[PDB]
Structure 1
Amino acid sequence: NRGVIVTGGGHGIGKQICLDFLEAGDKVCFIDIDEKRSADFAKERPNLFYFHGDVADPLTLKKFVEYAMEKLQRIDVLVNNACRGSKGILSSLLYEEFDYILSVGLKAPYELSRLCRDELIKNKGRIINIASTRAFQSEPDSEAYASAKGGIVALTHALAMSLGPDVLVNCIAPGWINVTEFTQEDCAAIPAGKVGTPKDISNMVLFLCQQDFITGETIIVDGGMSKRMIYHGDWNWFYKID
């Protein structure tokens, strides 16, 4: 019986989150940059509404929220999900492209939260932000993605402290989620022994929305990878110089 808005809803983790809310009995409105896949996803699913647009554009965010209000009539849950990867300093990623990554991954979650503020407060709703374990550890050439994801982890506790007790706000930080065959080493290198699936994330989204004593938190869902201490030559790991 909830109205749920989801960003990045036409594929991967976002798609599975939309499906899981539909299955829970909710109505879902999602925004996504790819019209074809998104229209198809929504087709012949009467409680699933698609809005085509780029979350990088603030005016689009306002029109998206207006559209969702027209279709859902109420907003109980906002899920901020933005998958776009990027390069960084080793690629000399230009200022404008770094900024764009921030627009999609950090400005949009703020602005959608701001647009939906009163409605979520009134409905005693929930905000769920999807980050990444890249907020906390880095591979080389990841500056833009790292910056957006670190920012959304902090934004999560900021929003939680602003909007509590009426709105609870939490973050999930996925590791490697298959959104598209893997080698034996690919799977065995992860402590949990498998690659993640969008359902591992969506199960956590739905669970967190039903809790009432968790707010401000970021939960890591990465099969234990970030907790594995790795030194060259020890416990099956090796570094190669090119």
Structure 2
Amino acid sequence: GTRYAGKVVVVTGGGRGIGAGIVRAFVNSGARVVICDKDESGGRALEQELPGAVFILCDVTQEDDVKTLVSETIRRFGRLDCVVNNAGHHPPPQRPEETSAQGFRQLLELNLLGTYTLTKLALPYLRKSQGNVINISSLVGAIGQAQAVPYVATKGAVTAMTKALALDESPYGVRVNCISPGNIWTPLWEELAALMPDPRASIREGMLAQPLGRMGQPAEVGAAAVFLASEANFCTGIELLVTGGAELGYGCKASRSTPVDAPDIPSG
């Protein structure tokens, strides 16, 4: 209710999904939240519903949109306490030979360099408030994912960059942390499933990937983000897993295209 009262927070990609869940969580903790999104529709709907959230149209791949975002946040609200780098994209499944260097560069511009550019421009103000940075990475940056080489690379970069930033900003008392969600039910997840030959079977496989037996919710990532900003004052450079246990224990991993022998020859 007052956990982060009067702090100014920027959330990129805050118009839907996990970002909207983070926006709602910070508004509920008393913050002024600047929603950054390339999509006017969801950001305007959130700005009208939530007093304390304002919407600024901004594409994080455009350096001038981000400079204006930071410039307007300071002009209109006088300070900056927390940046949540959430804007990102997961392409449909793609084998390595179905990827291009150009597609990889485009994904790096959004998932990695948008996060880098806003952080860099925000740091002079975060240093003045002893604020903090939260990056939304992914579990698959840590354990890999099939048919997702460009995406996995961008999220490994984000998690590592979080630790480098944590070391660079610790002399100012500025913390830098990341959240690595596993499977979270969002519009992105729904849109990816809808491209599969059996969307609900794909969703069910997504649920069975967790020992808890379900996907996570945006509100659960949101609560983790408010914790990191407002109560984790001795945490920096950590990777907070919000994954339902998906990384634990053995599971069925050998793919449908993978030659697997009968169990009378178990080790080749």
Larger Rg: 2
Say whether residues 1:112 and 2:118 are aligned partners: yes
Q: Which residue does the alignment assign to 1:240?
A: 256
2:90 corresponds to 1:85: yes
1:94 aligns with 2:100: yes
1:149 partner letter:
K
1:130–1:185 CA distance, 2 compared to 1 (3 A) = closer
What's the counterpart of residue 26 of structure 2? Answer: 21
For structure 1, the residue ranges without an aligned partner over 5 or more in a row are 233-237
Match 2:249 to one of 220, 228, 242: 228
Taking structure 2 as the reference length, what is the TM-score of the superposition?
0.82
Matched residue SS, 1:225 = coil
* Alignment partner of 1:193 is 2:243: no
User: Partner residue of 1:134?
Assistant: 140
Q: Secondary structure at the match of 1:43?
A: helix
Whole-Å separation in 2 of the counterparts to 1:4 and 1:42: 14
Contact 2:96 2:149 in 1 (8 A): no
1:86, distance to aligned residue in structure 2 (A): 1.8
1:47 counterpart = 2:63: no
* Aligned equivalents of 1:105, 1:241: Cα separation in 2: 30
Shift of 1:82: 2.3
State the distance in 2 between where 1:112 and 1:227 align. 34
Bigger CA drift: 168-177 or 138-147?
A: 138-147
Return the letter of the residue paired with 1:117: L
Structure-1 separation of matches of 2:209 and 2:143:
17
Confirm or deny: 8 A CA contact 2:183 2:206 kept in the other structure.
no
Q: Cα distance 1:82–1:184, how it changes in 2: closer, same or farther (>3 A)? A: closer
Aligned length: 237
User: Structure 1 residues 148 and 21 mapped into 2: Cα distance closer, same or farther (>3 Å)?
Assistant: same
- Judging changes above 3 Å, is the alpha-carbon distance between structure 1 residues 192 and 85 closer, same or farther for their aligned structure 2 residues? same
Partner of residue 159 from structure 2, selected from 150, 153, 161 = 153
Please, which moves more after superposition, 24-33 or 187-196? 187-196
- Post-superposition shift, 1:206? 0.6
Deviation at 1:192, TM superposition (A): 1.5
RMSD (Å), alpha carbons: 2.1
C-alpha contact 2:138 2:182 (8 A) present in aligned 1: yes
Is structure 2 residue 208 aligned with structure 1 residue 203?
A: no
- What amino acid is aligned across from residue 168 of structure 1 in structure 2? R
Q: Distance in 2 between matches of 1:118 and 1:213?
A: 21
Measure, in 2, the Cα distance between the counterparts of 1:91 and 1:47.
Answer: 46
Kindly state the Cα deviation for residue 54 of structure 1 after the two structures are TM-superposed: 1.4
The 3 A distance-change label for structure 1 pair 143 and 185 is closer
Pair 231,18 (structure 1): closer, same or farther in 2 beyond 3 Å: closer
Find runs of 4+ consecutive structure 1 residues off by over 4 angstroms.
181-186
Output the CA distance in 1 between the equivalents of 2:212 and 2:37.
31
How many Å apart are 1:141 and its aligned residue? Answer: 2.4
Given residue 232 of structure 2, which amino acid in structure 1 is its aligned partner?
Q
| Contact kept in structure 2, 1:91 and 1:141, CA below 8 Å | no
1:133 and 1:44 map into 2 onto residues whose CA distance is: 32
The structural deviation recorded for 1:188 is: 4.4
Equivalent position of 1:8 in the other structure: 13
- Report the more deviating stretch, 64-73 or 27-36: 64-73
Instruction: Say whether 1:33 aligns with 2:53.
Output: no
- Deviation string 1:166-204 (CA, Å, 9 cap, x unpaired) is 200100100000114887765444211221001111111
Percent identical among aligned pairs is: 30
Change beyond 3 A, Cα 1:86–1:187: closer
